[PDB]
Amino acid sequence: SMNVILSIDQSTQSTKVFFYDEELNIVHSNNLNHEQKCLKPGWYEHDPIEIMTNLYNLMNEGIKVLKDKYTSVIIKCIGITNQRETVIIWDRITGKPLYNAIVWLDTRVEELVTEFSAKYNNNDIQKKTGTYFNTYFSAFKILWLIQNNPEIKQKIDDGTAVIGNINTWLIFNLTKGNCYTDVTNASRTLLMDINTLQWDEKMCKIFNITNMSVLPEIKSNCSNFGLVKSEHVPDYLNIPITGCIGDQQSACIGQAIFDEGEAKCTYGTGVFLLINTGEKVVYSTCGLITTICYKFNDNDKPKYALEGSIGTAGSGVSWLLKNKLIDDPSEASDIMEKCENTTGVIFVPAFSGLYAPRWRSDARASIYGMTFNTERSHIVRALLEGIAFQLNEIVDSLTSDMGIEMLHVLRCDGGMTKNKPFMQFNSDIINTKIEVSKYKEVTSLGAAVLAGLEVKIWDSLDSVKSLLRRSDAVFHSKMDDKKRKKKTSEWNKAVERTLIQL
Amino acid sequence: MNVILSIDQSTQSTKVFFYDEELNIVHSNNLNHEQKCLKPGWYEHDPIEIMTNLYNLMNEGIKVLKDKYTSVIIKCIGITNQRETVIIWDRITGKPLYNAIVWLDTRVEELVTEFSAKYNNNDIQKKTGTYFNTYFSAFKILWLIQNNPEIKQKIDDGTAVIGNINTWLIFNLTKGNCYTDVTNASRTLLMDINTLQWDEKMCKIFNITNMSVLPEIKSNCSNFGLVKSEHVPDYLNIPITGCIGDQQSACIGQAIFDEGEAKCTYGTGVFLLINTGEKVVYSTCGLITTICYKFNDNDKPKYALEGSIGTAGSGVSWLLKNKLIDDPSEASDIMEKCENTTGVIFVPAFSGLYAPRWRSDARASIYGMTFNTERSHIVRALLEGIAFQLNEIVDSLTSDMGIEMLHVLRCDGGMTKNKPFMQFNSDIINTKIEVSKYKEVTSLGAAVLAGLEVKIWDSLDSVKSLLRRSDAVFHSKMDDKKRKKKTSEWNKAVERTLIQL
């Protein structure tokens, strides 16, 4: 008889389910991809019903498998984590989406952001929310929906719509109607006051959200999110949803970066570096976003973070695969062993613009330096190198904002962290010691932690921390400052070529 | 069955055509050879592979004809070839001292920069018809001299032969004749464009200390020798009677004989030539002054201005190698199905930019991609890039010729069958395009030269009617505002590619 924690990670490219035992070993896991719809230049959508169907199927297969291995199974609780910013507006009473999800990676609102940015003081927006206007957060997507679909406008006005991130969507469906979010996801909307942790009336007005009742209640990360009641997942009847957090913040909890100054970097569909700033709100002057790291309980002061976001990483590799430049993602290590340099090819991976720290939504993905000798392999390597170069820019902003000369370690996680030549190149270019987590799925691990803590599986966070801090690999820089400066100059000139106004 | 053998030793393959005396193709076949691109900038061919392929093609074709006809007589052989590509070999043994270094090779970029600084570039243009560049033979010869002491020593002692592909073919087929023709000699950077002789000052600049290693320059219709190679026994004592570089051959095959007439061939590269009559025209807009043809020794040559584009078919081949297209065949459907490029621009500068900008520092670059971009958009961008480059050349040509517009551009090549591609071309270059009826006008040109030399026909005037036949005309369907926009978008991309940072 087996107690387990279900951790759902509804990620950008796929939905993942993880069943953890109470020693935080994975006893079953699986995933299903869902369509990445890119209809037009800059558009990026998901089908919200496809996501739910995939979720239900994965939950049902998982309990079946477990009930096959074990004598009885007890699901103690459910934690939810998710791709952030992605937004769905749906009908409250029926649950019917009024439009597809518009994903974080969508950039159709470039024109709107240019328009609004000229009308508002960017420092005032940043003080309120933690960010300048951008194409990335939910708010301009919501605005676009309201401007382009009068049904949406009408139903926000009359309070018959719900505006939600993916976490809100999942909980609403599982619970048959609860409307909740958590402070980490709310901080990704451009609608929350970053200091007070409440929906901000002024921001709502800017974005034409005329009836704030359509917004879900903002909860702490460990909370009573409700009981599963969906008839699609009958074995899960009355199992409580007890933790909820945005994916990249989830990875902070899974990496145990709980002390001020500790930093992690997750390599996934995008790459996301967060540093814990303790209870102090730190506002960047270098292109980083101020966000909520976590707030476990209602009476806790939140821990804050500075975040550097990169949009093209795994999403780039996926693009390469679709367009036949790579036969399979698994090859990327072998490609980097065999292909020792790119023969000066540079790939500025800007398919959805540049995010942190330059924030140029007018950037597009660009390849430079090719000759007849250039092969697929070199193009693939150059895209991977471009991840590292972008991360280096982020690290430079972070050290400036933090008033430090270096990070002592960067804790890293993700599939790509198993690719030794890639991680070595990252360590070389960012000039930072990198410690790779033992767990790669640290996102799902953080959600299982929060859910378990909420139902007292363990007494305290302190009983799980030594477990969490485990590492299996370390990288140090092996690259000369001469060589590094030369490579970073090459990158910098290719970014200039990509950005110059002509 | 009396036939003319026309050999087209092209960049990517070797083709043989047997023509009857009415210029009908009775048999043809081809074989590819390796495009060796070992390092960035490097582009080589195996000279022995080319010869082996040609002998197999010749032997198979005469087997086919003698299976089909009761008696076969090969009246004569014409040779045409990829230009600029150079091979240095031992005179006695015929052994190559190094691979062919192809016209597309750009390893000499640093030397060209050095020499362009040291010498007066207008003087080089006045002498030879071109500025220093990575394209013509001479820098490649100089690189071999500087990097291979055996080549240096065999030039100095007069035991090597320095030859373009025509010279190489004729040397092997004849067991030793060392000949070139006027058109190929003009592609070396070593010939005086006015006197049509090897220039001692040029040879000095390129460290060619002994001019005896260079072949005799002949007219295009000439006695190039009799076939003697034991590898092609059935061809024993058949005369080789025409020889011309490929792009010039396409001039003959398109009947571009009058002053101001122009053609454009689409192949591995794209090459526009305009006949300037007996006048030598020096460009101020990046075009090269070349010889169009000189049939007999007595004739004043006909000159041309030429705009050369490196990445065309060579670009398609790269796309194919890198899995961005599954077969070349698909370009048309790609362009039908793909009505625009998602705003993507591909500056196809794998070996730098050739005419009219002549920037050896340029590299192939792709701009404007989003997650919506697909292979097909990138393919179509490369193809659009051909047309944008052609437009720049047409602009240079109308300036140099002192005209407002070309009346018509006669086009040939496999790409010219692709209606959406040709229509894009005609839109962007804003020039009427007339497509030749004949698909291998390069080989036709050599067949005409070879057969004229052995007097198969009364005159060139008898064959001209057949040569002029066209089957399609394109005119621009694009409005000036949309043309100006697109050309502005290309120009900004090129500027991004070229800005010195």
Residue numbers in the entry:
A (entry chain C): 0 to 501
B (entry chain A): 1 to 501
Text lifted from the article:
In agreement with gel filtration experiments (data not shown), PfGK is a dimer in the crystal.
The structure was refined against data extending to 1.5 Å spacing to give a final model that agrees well with the X-ray terms. The C3-OH of the glycerol forms hydrogen bonds to two water molecules that occupy a narrow channel to the protein surface. The apolar face of the glycerol moiety packs against the side-chains of Trp103 and Phe271, the latter representing the only glycerol-binding residue contributed by domain II.
